[PDB]
A paper describes a structure:
To produce a protein knot without open polypeptide ends, we chose the highly conserved bacterial RNA methyltransferase as a model system, namely YibK from Pseudomonas aeruginosa (PaYibK). YibK contains a trefoil knotted backbone topology. PaYibK also shares 65% sequence identity with one of the most-studied knotted proteins, YibK form Haemophilus influenzae (HiYibK), but contains only one tryptophan.
Residue numbers in the entry:
A (entry chain A): 4 to 45, 52 to 158
B (entry chain B): 4 to 42, 61 to 158
């Protein structure tokens, strides 16, 4: 059983996903990838991290397999800072691809208060995707005492 | 003028540094590399010269050997954060030159390897930044 579920929508850059696998193993998250991926799921990682990663043809297929978890989408076009939420066990965190970000139809399927953004300084480049996932997951984990369950 | 100072001790992998540059620019951090490398951003020959050039700020080091969880510190504007390399980690004599209550660890599941270097920096800086209300100053 996993504290949180990380969902990467059409990830493109192999080392980002590799770093995210390591993050999820450390924090106790499950990892789900929505096809098509920009790379083949073949770098430093073990078996008990790499073998639990799941792929799905469509985002809805993933959400159905997860039992329709509480879902947050992390997007610069987000109405609300990510740290304002009170996260809880079983929450799912949805991130867009490195070069495109989430489709409009995916983002708008969520309530306005569940489209979240990290604090960005105006004029700056985007954060690297795996850094964004790590900061999000550790904020949610911090709110739960860093419990290992 | 920079809220925090990120100090990388002998960083090895370039992509981590590209990620960390972007993280620091967003959080308002300066970036400092202690030479030698393997590939608001400056380089230094040894650690004390960076600390001096920075005005000797409060210094925390982030390590698995850490005596204290990173989220238990109350961070302040001007704090400096020291991270060891990807391949072998902070030298023993560098880490032991910090007070015990300033050698911090990120929460680790048993039997897990450390986070990527740039992910460790990202989580550390954003927790400090969160404590300061994510002020852009």
């Amino acid at each position: 059983s996993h504290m949180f579920h990380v969902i990467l929508f059409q990830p493109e850059i192999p080392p980002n996903t590799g770093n995210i696998i390591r993050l999820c193993a450390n924090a106790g998250c499950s990892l789900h990838l929505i096809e098509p991926l920009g790379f083949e799921l073949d770098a430093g990682l073990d078996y008990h991290e790499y073998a639990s990663v799941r792929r799905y043809p469509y985002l809805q297929s993933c959400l159905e397999a997860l039992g329709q978890p509480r879902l947050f989408a992390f997007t610069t076009k987000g109405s609300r800072a990510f740290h304002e939420v009170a996260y809880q066990r079983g929450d799912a965190f949805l991130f867009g691809p490195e070069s495109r970000g989430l489709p409009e139809d995916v983002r708008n399927a969520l309530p306005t208060d569940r489209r979240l953004r990290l604090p960005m300084r105006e004029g700056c480049r985007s954060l690297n995707l795996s850094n964004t996932v790590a900061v999000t997951v550790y904020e949610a984990w911090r709110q739960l005492g860093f419990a290992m369950d």
